[PDB]
């Protein structure tokens, strides 16, 4: 059975969990206590040498980097559940393009907003409000491009839900809830409808209700 390492409430393990749930892959979650620095202990560094989560162990196979992991399980269980990769090479390419947009243009801004507004105060530290404002300004412009895309396509990589949409679920949920920046989605009609659609998927609702 697949072992997934990391907290269920953290963005990066959530991305992996969402894919496994969508694909109907049974897994065991192994909590890693990030606040206390368990991820930097020698024992865990043998699993993930950069001292980050997630990492998966599946028999004698080990893999880390969340977006590598979701690609692997989407392919390994390609014929089970939803088509998360696309079929033609050109369809697959658009999924890859919007995964790459997620992983830099979007996440570099969004995860750092969540870090400053949510993570730091939770471990008793002050966030940098002026830095957060610079991120917000940049993110408006990034999300204007998302809105343009979603005016022409139901989902980011085409007319169906794929890894590209899935990969946005964890950081976006923190952005529009704990971080109080829901307007970035609500201000944009197509983006908002996309968000309310993908975040209502049964696999995601399951994952978030368990997390609290």
Ligand X SMILES: *SC[C@H](NC(=O)CC[C@H](N)C(=O)O)C(=O)NCC(=O)O
HSE-up of residue 68 (Cα within 13 Å, Cβ side):
8
CB of 79 to ligand X, least distance (A): 26
Computed on alpha carbons and rounded to an integer, the radius of gyration of the chain in Å comes to: 17
With the C-alpha atoms ordered 119, 121, 123, 126, is the resulting torsion angle positive or negative? positive
Q: Tokens 């105060």 appear where?
A: 121
CB of 63 to ligand X, least distance (A): 10
Q: Does 19 show up as a binding residue in the annotation?
A: no
Diameter over CA atoms, the chain: 49
Structure tokens at 132: 């957060």
Return the SS3 of 56. Answer: strand
Whether omega for the bond prior to residue 54 falls within 30 degrees of 0, making it cis, is: yes
- What residue 133 binds from a copy of itself, ligand X, none (CB within 5 to 8 A, per partner kind)? none
Lateral strand order in the sheet of 61-64: 27-30, 2-5, 55-58, 61-64
Residues near a copy of itself, by CB under 8 A:
49-50, 61, 63-69, 71-72, 75-76, 89-90, 92-94, 96-97, 99-101, 103-105, 142, 145, 148-149
- What residue 99 binds from ligand X, a copy of itself, none (CB within 5 to 8 A, per partner kind)? a copy of itself
**Between 54 and 86, whose beta carbon lies closer to ligand X?**
54
Q: Does 12 show up as a binding residue in the annotation?
A: yes
CB of 189 to ligand X, least distance (A): 27
Closest residue to ligand X in the complex (CB) = 12
Q: Does 167 show up as a binding residue in the annotation?
A: no
Binding residues: 12, 39, 52-53, 66-67
Binding residues for glutathione: 12, 39, 52-53, 66-67
């Amino acid at each position: 059975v697949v072992k997934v390492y990391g907290p269920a409430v953290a963005v990066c393990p959530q991305r992996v969990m969402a894919c496994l749930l969508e694909k109907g892959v049974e897994f065991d979650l192994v909590h890693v206590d990030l606040d206390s620095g368990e991820q930097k202990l020698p024992e865990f560094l043998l699993k993930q040498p950069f001292g980050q989560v997630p990492v998966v162990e599946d028999g004698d196979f080990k893999l880390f980097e969340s977006r590598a992991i979701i690609r692997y399980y989407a392919a390994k269980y390609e014929d089970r559940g939803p088509n998360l990769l696309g079929n033609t090479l050109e369809e697959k390419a658009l999924v890859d393009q919007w995964l790459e947009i997620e992983a830099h243009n979007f996440n570099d801004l969004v995860f750092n907003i969540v870090f400053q507004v949510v993570i730091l105060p939770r471990i008793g530290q002050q966030g940098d409000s002026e830095l957060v404002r610079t991120y917000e300004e940049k993110l408006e412009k990034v999300l204007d491009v998302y809105e343009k895309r979603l005016s022409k396509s139901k989902y980011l990589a085409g007319d169906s839900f794929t890894l590209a949409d899935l990969s946005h679920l964890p950081a976006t949920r923190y952005l529009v809830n704990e971080a109080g920046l829901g307007h970035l989605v609500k201000d944009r009609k197509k983006l908002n409808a996309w968000w309310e659609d993908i975040s209502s998927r049964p696999a995601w609702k399951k994952l978030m209700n368990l997390a609290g």
